[PDB]
């Protein structure tokens, strides 16, 4: 099976890339597995595979940490993401995001039902499992529970059957056969939960699949449009129909090679304590438990020697930064272009902790619109901040054609030197705000409203006649023949060059 | 020793394996600057150009990147440390503490010596032509050959009670003139104005290149109005600086200066100046203005004289390491003298030295029983109405958990703890720095406003204390488990 279509092959691909460390000695799921994974994420080291978890029983379970985190080397920085998508390990973020957007204007490819798969190799009914006895990790010391669900895919269907959504939302063990987790607007798991709640007849049929086809977990993290079944979008992106098997206890379909599957119901009535949790912005607030949605587990099915993927999320750099920010920025790029805004590129700089998106403007098309910064800022803000894809982003930085928005240092340079504080920004107080950012939910203002800004790092001539500066850098302040002579004599003179394929 | 003599400083860079000697012919027209620019962009070894095309009777060799960064994290600031008699592993906290140390010490006045190495050679008006010397063209669109990027201007108040040492750019105008920036609120401009109001004579002036490294650090620091830099450097180094009188005026220059120009700064004349590739990383090729005009009457120089050169622009060069860091040092001291609970200040390099992050002693903040709106306003009023705050447009207030010397920690705090609009106070009625592109080439007044105080303190920091832990390796795992993970790291297969 290809690495992008089967988590078990993905684990083998990381091993062949020399991008895996197999830890075969006993590791405690109480903090130790997550501490090692956290250190990996903070240093961009190899992904840890914990083959010997204290408490593993009857093949449940091994843990792969850091499945979507960065590699140390600059050349294959994004190689773990590339391996989710059948891209070369050297793929740029522009190439990864173009791949994730490619299904946007293609016919969906419906999944194929198969009679069985590896995910049916072992099963436990409700009398045979206890979620409190599995080696579920405690990820951060102050977490309000053991977060089993950090990199699995929730599967829920609209009541009329026309929309099946795949998405990542966190969940923790509540008791032997229940989870609690975040089911929040405007997320699709929440939109579908509300349809079931308004019908008022039944709890939501639900499955949670861990170790799904890597291309599916990428779509699970991406805010593709309302009403669009992720499975058909992934089929189109990969050029292949995904193989799905029916759940034993409900009529939902799960990827045939899923490592671990939970089958059950998401309650339309019951809640339970959820959180706190060490989250994407780099914080945990220990005194901070709230009521979350409650999931009932009726059955567990799993592969022989099942592997549970785990995100030890927090400060830079993990799955919450590489996948949440980047895939939101991709969808924002597409939204801008569909609203006839001259945006070529979007990226959420890691330095912003997933809270900014930098929009690269085609200034030739900006010049033809004959507008001003005040008018253009309002127009961009009103599109992005009134769409689901803009929900988690609080600052948009508009930059011209000379800025590579995939390079955080170039975005911070442009922001610091081209955006006059106050005058070149528009504040948005009457838009949905993201409560999870500390300055929102733990801040001086409304938790769920405003706190957003459009910052124009376009210089005045970019709107009229064109760029009227040169960078004071090696590339732009010296002629081509001189630069080539300096590069050709660099090591000869006794300076050193960073080797593209080796340097960190 | 290195901190008292530029020639010994070059020798120290050699011992540190932090110098590349280039003995093949190098063109001062862009090539020396292009090599220096690439050094600064990659944190490579400082280039010493021993063989410039057009060198004339020992004028001159060039040292590039004298105050730029080293590649290794262990000795990142070692080229700065070597200006100040600190170890090459010195932290930015230790460098800035050294630079502030002389603030509450008695000045040590300089010692006058009859002669020194800077007198080894001399050229009167008939003997030199500035247009025939190997002065660098530093960027292809510069409006002139900028001879002056790392020399010290020396001017004195009319009443003789204040002698100022400072860096300001100057370019060759003709055989015996320079043009340069003399701009408020800078001390060269303050002293210029004193002579203008007197109305009687041009300003006696000297420009010394390759001065005692400790003096070029004080030359780039905004020490208070009226304070003679020589006496400040004396107190900081615990020694009296050795100065020699100029041949053609009564100003005193460091005895070991590589190259000295003696003459006058005109109170009446101007000439075209710029454009120049500048500290924010831009040049606007359409952009010549009338600048101050200097007349050179005499050149004295060492045998085998070395001209230091800043090839300034995008990160990282002397304009970032020295201008931002030394301004941030003075702002820290200014805050403490105004009874503000600031422990540390630094201008993150990511901000292109437009931001300063102020680390707050939050125990002292809680005892003040204040709010964000009040505290931001007090901090901005102090810093943005002072010369030391002139070049800084954004102040970021952070609590005790943030290392302000780490740009990644400042950017994290800024991005996660400061709500846009609500947690910020804009300042429009304060002097603004025209050289930042968004000011002089922007949508608003070039010399006014565009400043902000961004409060990245969380609400409980003002009241009861921090109510979070970072979701990081340091804070979300117990000490015994962190130690076990670090002890077993290489044994498990990690690097
Ligand atoms: C990759 C990734 C994404 C998410 C999460 C995580 C990872 C690793 C956690 C580690 C579990 C932390 C948590 O913040 N988490 C998370 C979350 N969205 C939520 O509503 N709730 C969550 O608890 N997203 C983002 C969502 O997956 C995307 O916003 C996606 O677009 C949703 O799909 P849809 O609603 O658009 O179908
Ligand atoms: C280290 C350094 C400092 C400065 C400069 C450079 C270097 C390398 C140039 C490469 C020449 C570029 C130019 O931007 N430049 C420069 C300048 N200040 C000016 O008014 N004008 C200038 O043209 N400063 C900053 C000043 O040296 C400090 O602000 C100092 O505090 C002033 O001294 P004082 O007036 O406080 O005595
Ligand atoms: K999704
Ligand atoms: K602007
Ligand atoms: K000075
Ligand atoms: K106050
Ligand atoms: K704040
Ligand atoms: Mn969806
Ligand atoms: Mn001064």
The fraction of residues in strands of chain A falls at: 15-25%
In which range does the helix fraction of chain A lie?
Answer: 25-40%
* Cofactors, ions and other ligands in the entry: hydroxylated prenyl-FMN, potassium ion, manganese (II) ion
Which secondary-structure class do the elements of chain A indicate?
A: alpha+beta
Sheet with most strands of chain A: 8 strands, antiparallel
Measured distance between first and last alpha carbons of chain A: 32 Å
Number of strands of chain A: 22
Largest interface: A-B, 91 and 90 residues
Tally of separate domains of chain A: 3
Taking all Cα atoms into account, the compactness measure Rg of chain A is: 24 Å
Give me the number of helical elements of chain A: 14
Rough outline of chain A: globular
The oligomeric status of these chains comes to: homodimer
Q: What is the strand and helix layout of this fold?
A:
The structure is a homodimer.
Chain A: H1 7-16, E1 20-23, H2 32-43, E2 47-50, E3 62-65, H3 79-82, H4 93-101, E4 112-113, E5 122-125, E6 153-157, E7 164-167, E8 171-175, E9 178-181, H5 188-199, E10 204-210, H6 214-220, H7 230-238, E11 243-246, E12 253-255, E13 260-274, E14 283-284, E15 290-302, E16 307-310, H8 319-338, E17 343-347, E18 356-361, H9 363-369, H10 373-384, E19 395-399, H11 408-418, E20 425-428, H12 438-441, E21 452-456, E22 470-471, H13 480-488, H14 490-493
The structure holds hydroxylated prenyl-FMN (BYN) (2 copies), potassium ion (K) (5 copies) and manganese (II) ion (MN) (2 copies).
């Amino acid at each position: 099976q290809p690495a992008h279509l089967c988590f078990r092959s993905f684990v083998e691909a990381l091993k062949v890339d020399n991008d895996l460390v197999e830890i075969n000695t006993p590791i405690d799921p109480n903090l130790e597995a997550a501490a090692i994974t956290r250190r990996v994420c903070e240093t961009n080291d190899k992904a840890p595979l914990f083959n010997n978890l204290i408490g593993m029983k009857n093949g449940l379970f091994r843990i792969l940490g850091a499945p979507g985190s960065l590699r140390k080397s600059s050349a294959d920085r994004y190689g773990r993401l590339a391996r989710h998508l059948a891209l070369p390990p050297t793929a740029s973020m522009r190439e990864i995001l173009d791949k994730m957007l490619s299904a946007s204007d293609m016919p969906p490819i419906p999944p194929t039902i198969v009679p069985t798969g590896p995910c049916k190799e072992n099963s436990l009914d409700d009398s045979e499992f206890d979620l409190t006895e599995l080696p579920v990790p405690l990820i951060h010391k102050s977490d309000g529970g053991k977060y089993i669900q950090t990199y699995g895919m929730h599967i829920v269907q609209s009541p009329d059957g026309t929309w099946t959504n795949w998405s990542i939302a966190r969940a923790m063990v509540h008791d032997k056969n229940h989870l609690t987790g975040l089911v929040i607007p405007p997320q699709h798991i929440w939109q579908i939960h509300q349809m079931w709640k308004k019908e008022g007849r039944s709890d939501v049929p639900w499955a949670l699949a861990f170790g799904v086809p890597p291309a599916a977990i990428m779509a699970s993290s991406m805010p593709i449009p309302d009403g669009v079944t992720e499975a058909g979008y992934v089929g189109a992106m990969t050029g292949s129909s995904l193989e799905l098997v029916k759940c034993d206890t409900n009529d939902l379909y799960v990827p045939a090679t899923s490592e671990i599957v939970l089958e059950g119901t998401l309650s339309i009535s019951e809640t339970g304590p959820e959180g706190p949790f060490g989250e994407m912005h780099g914080y945990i607030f220990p005194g901070d438990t709230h009521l979350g949605a409650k999931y009932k587990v009726n059955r567990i099915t799993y592969r022989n020697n099942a592997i549970m993927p785990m995100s030890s999320c927090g400060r830079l750099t993990d799955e919450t930064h590489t996948m949440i920010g980047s895939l939101a920025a991709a969808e924002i790029r597409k939204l801008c272009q569909q609203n006839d805004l001259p945006i070529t590129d979007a990226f959420a700089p890691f330095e912003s902790q997933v809270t900014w998106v930098a929009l690269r403007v085609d200034t030739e098309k900006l010049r033809a619109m004959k507008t001003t910064s005040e008018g253009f800022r309002k127009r961009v803000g009103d599109v992005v901040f009134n769409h689901k894809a803009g929900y988690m982003i609080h600052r948009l930085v508009l930059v011209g054609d000379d800025i590579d928005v995939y390079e955080g240092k170039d975005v911070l340079w442009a922001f610091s030197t081209r955006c006059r504080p106050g005058m070149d920004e528009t504040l948005f107080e009457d838009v949905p705000g993201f409560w999870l950012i500390p300055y929102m939910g733990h801040g001086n203002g409304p938790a769920h409203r405003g706190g957003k800004v459009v910052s124009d790092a376009l210089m005045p001539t970019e709107y009229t006649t064109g760029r009227n500066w040169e960078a004071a850098d090696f590339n732009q302040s010296y002629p081509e023949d001189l630069k080539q002579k300096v590069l050709d004599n660099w090591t000869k003179m006794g300076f050193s060059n960073l080797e593209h394929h080796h340097h960190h």
